[PDB]
Design a protein around this ligand. Structure first.
Ligand SMILES: *[C@@H]1O[C@H](CO)[C@@H](O[C@@H]2O[C@H](CO)[C@@H](O[C@@H]3O[C@H](CO[C@H]4O[C@H](CO)[C@@H](O)[C@H](O)[C@@H]4O)[C@@H](O)[C@H](O[C@H]4O[C@H](CO)[C@@H](O)[C@H](O)[C@@H]4O)[C@@H]3O)[C@H](O)[C@H]2NC(C)=O)[C@H](O)[C@H]1NC(C)=O
Ligand SMILES: *[C@@H]1O[C@H](CO)[C@@H](O[C@@H]2O[C@H](CO)[C@@H](O[C@@H]3O[C@H](CO)[C@@H](O)[C@H](O)[C@@H]3O)[C@H](O)[C@H]2NC(C)=O)[C@H](O)[C@H]1NC(C)=O
Ligand SMILES: *[C@@H]1O[C@H](CO)[C@@H](O[C@@H]2O[C@H](CO)[C@@H](O[C@@H]3O[C@H](CO)[C@@H](O)[C@H](O)[C@@H]3O)[C@H](O)[C@H]2NC(C)=O)[C@H](O)[C@H]1NC(C)=O
Ligand SMILES: *[C@@H]1O[C@H](CO)[C@@H](O[C@@H]2O[C@H](CO)[C@@H](O)[C@H](O)[C@H]2NC(C)=O)[C@H](O)[C@H]1NC(C)=O
Ligand SMILES: *[C@@H]1O[C@H](CO)[C@@H](O[C@@H]2O[C@H](CO)[C@@H](O)[C@H](O)[C@H]2NC(C)=O)[C@H](O)[C@H]1NC(C)=O
Ligand SMILES: *[C@@H]1O[C@H](CO)[C@@H](O[C@@H]2O[C@H](CO)[C@@H](O)[C@H](O)[C@H]2NC(C)=O)[C@H](O)[C@H]1NC(C)=O
Ligand SMILES: *[C@@H]1O[C@H](CO)[C@@H](O[C@@H]2O[C@H](CO)[C@@H](O)[C@H](O)[C@H]2NC(C)=O)[C@H](O)[C@H]1NC(C)=O
Ligand SMILES: *[C@@H]1O[C@H](CO)[C@@H](O[C@@H]2O[C@H](CO)[C@@H](O)[C@H](O)[C@H]2NC(C)=O)[C@H](O)[C@H]1NC(C)=O
Ligand code: NAG
Ligand code: NAG
Ligand code: NAG
Ligand code: NAG
Ligand code: NAG
Ligand code: NAG
Ligand code: NAG
Ligand code: NAG
Ligand code: NAG
Ligand code: NAG
Ligand code: NAG
Ligand code: NAG
Ligand code: NAG
Ligand code: NAG
Ligand code: NAG
Ligand code: NAG
Ligand code: NAG
Ligand code: NAG
Ligand code: NAG
Ligand code: NAG
Lengths: 453, 124, 124, 124, 53
């Protein structure tokens, strides 16, 4: 009676976090066009038309990025995705043979007075007792000499093997959703301003988030998801220069990038059954690759970001921008993909300004390579074949990364310059508001009354 | 109106207690192995506590009572405010270092005695 | 005599209704992955509707009744000929655009009210 | 005291019969495929007899009775010494060439008649 | 049992190429004593007398 007994309830909402594996799911159309083959999104359990989202009430929660397990899950699978898409297409060992050449003739007749290197060597034919003579082109960023016509070599035949790209597979990213299995939930909170960590007042749960386009780029995030109405800054340990600086913005700015010289190709056979593609001959003028940008808008957003950036550095201090430092090229330039080729743009024509506290187009030069040591790995490398036609791609600039300098205490008007050279943080830039959790249905509590026998 | 999945988890007991069906209606709703590891994991967590519910004399009954009384060394809060001013997230952390004593004492209290008396009352 | 698996599926109701056990007795009866995909698929379809039966107040009972009456906007055929002159293949296509209204109204009709009244009749 | 898993298997009936919970509490407790073959095998043996118990009118009841009497051509030993001087390892080999007659006659004895009379006693 | 190798080595590494770092025996410096093993005598007598009984 006035003693109380116990009862058992099943399926009551509580959660305590954990970590498990995940899976991916995205299609509406892309398997039907497919270009007969794409980088491996092949079955992937195609998604749902109308996703589910439930707003929550009277709930707070601690939120911490930089410790999410999900970013390493996106790190590990793309590595396993990349080589698996690259492996069963055709190998080539016997290319890196000795070679001698000099430059091309109207290389000196252009704005691009640089490096073309009309070149030639011996190569085995389909029959083992026959050789053949070829004639081809290679940039100086893909050739280096030994220390007579001083003989050359490819860049890192001295380190690892080289495998050419498979001729039909595209590299263009498709949006992907990542979705959690049963007995789990994903939490996102929908505040406008979000300065990295801490509690969040209004949360909600979704089985699987919006699409992420895995673009491979440095110093400028492109085709990224856009922020809310106001620009934000994110970090770990500002006033401790070891880590990097992430900034997201609201007004996207255009960029146009082209390659003028359409420079037709040829194809011979290594044999048996190794159809090797190589660079043919060029016809027409020579203009090197470059990109345009709207000037006044770039002034406007840079004036926008410096007003926001000042709050974490006092009031009356002076901010100066600078170019990259040096070392390898791959942290200096802005590298990205477009149409199946890889550009390297100098971007020194942006971070050249000081700032005092009180229809034109910037043309920046770009260069191209043909051998990539992607994902900071040593042990493999890929060769990309050239593509005919004139390529042209447009994108939205959305999100730059920054790095401090040395100096002294808070008096000497600290500066900034780009850099970074990592790829994990770019996914940390766009998974900032998600975390996994596991439900627990079982509960027990005392009730008032008793049980019939 | 249907509040939805994990709906009133910030609310109090009596609001949350009346809607319990939707937690079960959502509970079982190269890249082939990692998908297949998920479905064998999802079937494992569901089937585990299911018989652990079924051993307690409650087969498919979502809410059910039992026989064992409450040892008052567990909590001291009497009846009313625990149904009226706390959440389950507040509740479950509060009684955490008890459950191993709870579950073992629960199961033998019914399903040893209440079957043996069943084997003696249906006897005669 | 035992007619066998999927036996009287062309017959009428009352012949088919009396023999229902054999549908359960057959329900769970490089080349390793594709076999293993079958067994995880077979366990998935069986375990899905099992709790979906179990949520309806019918745990292991093969045939069971309930509480909700029949809305006569569903069918108009009264009692006799539907047990006497149609097949289940004739039946299931005929009532197809109803079942989502049926299943949701079924489950809360018992297992919200009939447990809350159970929590009030076993109360006093 | 808790004797433990597979504890009194050398003992007699009445000692072994009173402790049956622990057999269920332990029943579901490159090198990824062979582990994964184990868990799909373990879930298969458990889920198989579970519904085979559930078809017999015993859903989650660990011990339950039934309706069918005993044909005395099966055994002749009357009541007392079989509970007092044999083991289950002695028992199960002794009645081995009977079980197929047992299981089929068991299931239709309840769950054909006892549901049809249920459909006729709850009728009026 | 104790077992040793006295004449250790110094080693060199040559590249087969592309990317096949081959290792091989370099040169030896010092004396040469071949590999061997010591064993306690009387205990080996004792266990052999033990096993034959
Ligand atoms: C950031 O986001 C932007 C915006 O989408 C992306 O830019 C697009 O990139 C794609 C991928 O290259 C571009 O697609 C290319 O379009 C060219 C123009 O095609 C148009 O015209 C043809 C008829 O001639 C139509 O069929 C077609 O649908 C277009 O309307 C084509 O010349 C290219 O063709 C190549 O592929 C096709 C199919 O594989 C072949 O038939 C061709 O021979 C050739 O191989 C290609 O289809 C697209 O134009 C870009 N712009 C826009 C506005 O969508 C960026 O790629 C993305 N990422 C980055 C890093 O910036
Ligand atoms: C910068 O890096 C560190 C590590 O995360 C954090 O702050 C720094 O920690 C060191 C080591 O504890 C501090 O040194 C301390 O100095 C005092 C002298 O007053 C000494 O008594 C302590 O025992 C200790 O040695 C250091 O002051 C501190 N700060 C800096 C700027 O180095 C911090 O998490 C990181 N981020 C920021 C923004 O500082
Ligand atoms: C195994 O048994 C052999 C004996 O057969 C042991 O060999 C002995 O090892 C010692 C230690 O090196 C030698 O002594 C050395 O002599 C030189 C002479 O100048 C001296 O400069 C050193 O300081 C040291 O004293 C000894 O000559 C040698 N004897 C023989 C017969 O080889 C050996 O140590 C045993 N153990 C192992 C692990 O091999
Ligand atoms: C493989 O070839 C590369 C070519 O890049 C070598 O890198 C050169 O190393 C020397 C060593 O002092 C530098 O002076 C050159 O500037 C480097 N080249 C470039 C282009 O920067 C590398 O040493 C070779 N060997 C290995 C083991 O990597
Ligand atoms: C993120 O923004 C929030 C929202 O203002 C900050 O939270 C409070 O900020 C005020 C500003 O004066 C402080 O006085 C409060 O103490 C803050 N509340 C706390 C800490 O609970 C928060 O400080 C910002 N965090 C970062 C890292 O920028
Ligand atoms: C990017 O900007 C350059 C200007 O530097 C544009 O180049 C002009 O293109 C027209 C078209 O034939 C020529 O008549 C001009 O002489 C070019 N100017 C210069 C300085 O070369 C270019 O069109 C812009 N757009 C793209 C996509 O490259
Ligand atoms: C990007 O362009 C700038 C602009 O010329 C290059 O900076 C030059 O660097 C050399 C070598 O340090 C100096 O001698 C020149 O004086 C610099 N130019 C100016 C205007 O200061 C820079 O090298 C380019 N970066 C890359 C990676 O090509
Ligand atoms: C056997 O190991 C010894 C370890 O001491 C090697 O001798 C050393 O080699 C280093 C190499 O830089 C010298 O700096 C030391 O002075 C050497 N110590 C000596 C000689 O006592 C010895 O080289 C090894 N044997 C062989 C054949 O390489
Ligand atoms: C949320 O909290 C307020 C504050 O007491 C309460 O009145 C309300 O009922 C809660 N639940 C909701 C809005 O579902
Ligand atoms: C190719 O082989 C022939 C064979 O003698 C040789 O004369 C010629 O110099 C070789 N050319 C190159 C570029 O190795
Ligand atoms: C460049 O494009 C034109 C477009 O008609 C084509 O005719 C030509 O073959 C291409 N290649 C050159 C000029 O090398
Ligand atoms: C980039 O190209 C697009 C193509 O339509 C054009 O609309 C836009 O004005 C261009 N922007 C710049 C900065 O050249
Ligand atoms: C940007 O515009 C401001 C006016 O708002 C002007 O004072 C400043 O000099 C401009 N800077 C650049 C780099 O164009
Ligand atoms: C720095 O300037 C901003 C701009 O109004 C102001 O809000 C802020 O309070 C200033 N900082 C301090 C420490 O007063
Ligand atoms: C950098 O700025 C200085 C000063 O305005 C200018 O003289 C120089 O040309 C600029 N360099 C580039 C690459 O824009
Ligand atoms: C770039 O930004 C504009 C601004 O709304 C948007 O309409 C466009 O879709 C963006 N580009 C891509 C590829 O999303
Ligand atoms: C409650 O538990 C304690 C052990 O913590 C025990 O000593 C006491 O006798 C128990 N009381 C009842 C009524 O079971
Ligand atoms: C216990 O009863 C008292 C009566 O005075 C009441 O004030 C208190 O809120 C009750 N406690 C709980 C947990 O309901
Ligand atoms: C309560 O639970 C925590 C969980 O880590 C444990 O560390 C602590 O010892 C427990 N307190 C007890 C059993 O008194
Ligand atoms: C087959 O259909 C006829 C039609 O009336 C019926 O009389 C007969 O009993 C049916 N037989 C079986 C075995 O279903
Ligand atoms: C039957 O369903 C209709 C909706 O299709 C509803 O308007 C009507 O009130 C229902 N009748 C009963 C008795 O439930
Ligand atoms: C309904 O009852 C009438 C009585 O006249 C009968 O003729 C008809 O067959 C019945 N309908 C059904 C479906 O049994
Ligand atoms: C009946 O079901 C079919 C199934 O495709 C559907 O297309 C149709 O719209 C439904 N009719 C209704 C809901 O009235
Ligand atoms: C027992 O089984 C035998 C068949 O072995 C049968 O002939 C006999 O009638 C059965 N007796 C009873 C009482 O069921
Ligand atoms: C059957 O009853 C007799 C009574 O004389 C008894 O001696 C015998 O032990 C009993 N058999 C069994 C199996 O209990
Ligand atoms: C009893 O079972 C064994 C098992 O192998 C079988 O060989 C034997 O024939 C059976 N005896 C019968 C059914 O009489
Ligand atoms: C073997 O070497 C160990 C090293 O500590 C030593 O203790 C032991 O006595 C040696 N045994 C023989 C038989 O030499
Ligand atoms: C072993 O020791 C025994 C003494 O127990 C002795 O007689 C015999 O000769 C020894 N044998 C060897 C091989 O040392």
């Amino acid at each position: 009676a006035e003693n109380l007994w116990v009862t058992v309830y099943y399926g009551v909402p509580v959660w305590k976090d954990a970590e498990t594996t995940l899976f991916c799911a995205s299609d509406a159309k892309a398997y039907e066009t497919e270009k007969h083959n794409v980088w491996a999104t092949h079955a992937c359990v195609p998604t749902d038309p109308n996703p589910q989202e439930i707003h929550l009430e009277n709930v707070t929660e601690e939120f911490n990025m930089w410790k999410n397990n999900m970013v390493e899950q996106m790190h590990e699978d793309i590595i396993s995705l990349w080589d698996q898409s690259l492996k069963p297409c055709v190998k080539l060992t016997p290319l890196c043979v000795t070679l001698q050449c000099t430059n091309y003739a109207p290389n000196l007749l252009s704005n691009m007075r640089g490096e073309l290197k009309q070149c030639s060597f011996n190569m085995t034919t389909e029959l083992r007792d026959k050789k053949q003579k070829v004639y081809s082109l290679f940039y100086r960023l893909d050739v280096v000499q030994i220390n007579s016509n001083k003989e050359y070599r490819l860049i890192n035949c001295n380190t690892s093997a080289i495998t050419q790209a498979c001729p039909k597979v595209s590299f263009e990213p498709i949006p992907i959703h990542y979705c959690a299995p049963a007995g789990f939930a994903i939490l996102k909170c929908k505040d406008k301003k979000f300065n990295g960590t801490g509690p969040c007042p209004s949360v909600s749960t979704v089985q699987c988030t919006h699409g992420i386009k895995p673009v491979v780029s440095t110093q400028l995030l492109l085709n990224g998801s856009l922020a809310e109405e106001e620009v934000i800054i994110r970090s770990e340990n500002i006033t401790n220069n070891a880590k990097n600086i992430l900034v997201q913005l609201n007004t996207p700015v255009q960029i146009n990038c082209t390659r003028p010289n359409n420079n037709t190709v040829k194809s011979i056979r290594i044999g048996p059954g190794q159809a090797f593609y190589y660079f043919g001959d060029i016809i027409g003028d020579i203009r090197m690759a470059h990109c345009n940008v709207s000037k006044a808008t770039w002034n406007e957003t840079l004036g926008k970001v410096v007003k926001q950036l000042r709050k974490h550095f006092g009031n009356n201090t002076i901010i100066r921008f600078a170019q990259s430092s040096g070392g390898d090229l791959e942290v200096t330039t802005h590298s990205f993909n477009c149409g199946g080729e890889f550009f390297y743009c100098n971007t020194s024509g942006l971070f050249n300004s000081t700032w005092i506290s009180n229809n034109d187009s910037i043309v920046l030069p770009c260069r191209i390579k043909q051998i990539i040591n992607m994902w900071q790995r040593i042990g493999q490398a890929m060769y990309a074949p050239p593509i005919q036609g004139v390529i042209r791609c447009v994108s939205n600039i959305t999100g730059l990364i920054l790095t401090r300098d040395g100096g002294s205490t808070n008096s000497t008007t600290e500066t900034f310059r780009p850099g970074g050279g990592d790829m994990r943080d770019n996914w940390r830039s766009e998974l900032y508001k998600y975390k996994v959790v596991k439900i627990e249905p079982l509960g027990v509590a005392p009730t008032r009354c008793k049980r019939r026998v | 109106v249907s509040l939805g999945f994990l709906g009133a988890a910030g609310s109090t007991m009596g609001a949350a207690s009346m809607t319990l069906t939707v937690q079960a209606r959502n509970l079982l709703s190269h890249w082939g192995i990692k998908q297949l590891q998920a479905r064998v994991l999802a079937v494992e967590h569901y089937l585990r506590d299911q018989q652990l519910l079924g051993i307690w004399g409650c087969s498919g009954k979502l809410i059910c009572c039992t026989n064992v009384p409450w040892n008052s060394s567990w909590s001291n809060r009497n009846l009313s405010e625990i149904w009226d001013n706390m959440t389950w997230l507040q509740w479950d952390k509060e009684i955490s270092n008890y459950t191993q004593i709870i579950y073992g004492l629960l199961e033998e209290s019914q399903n040893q005695q209440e079957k043996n008396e069943q084997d003696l009352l249906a006897l005669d």
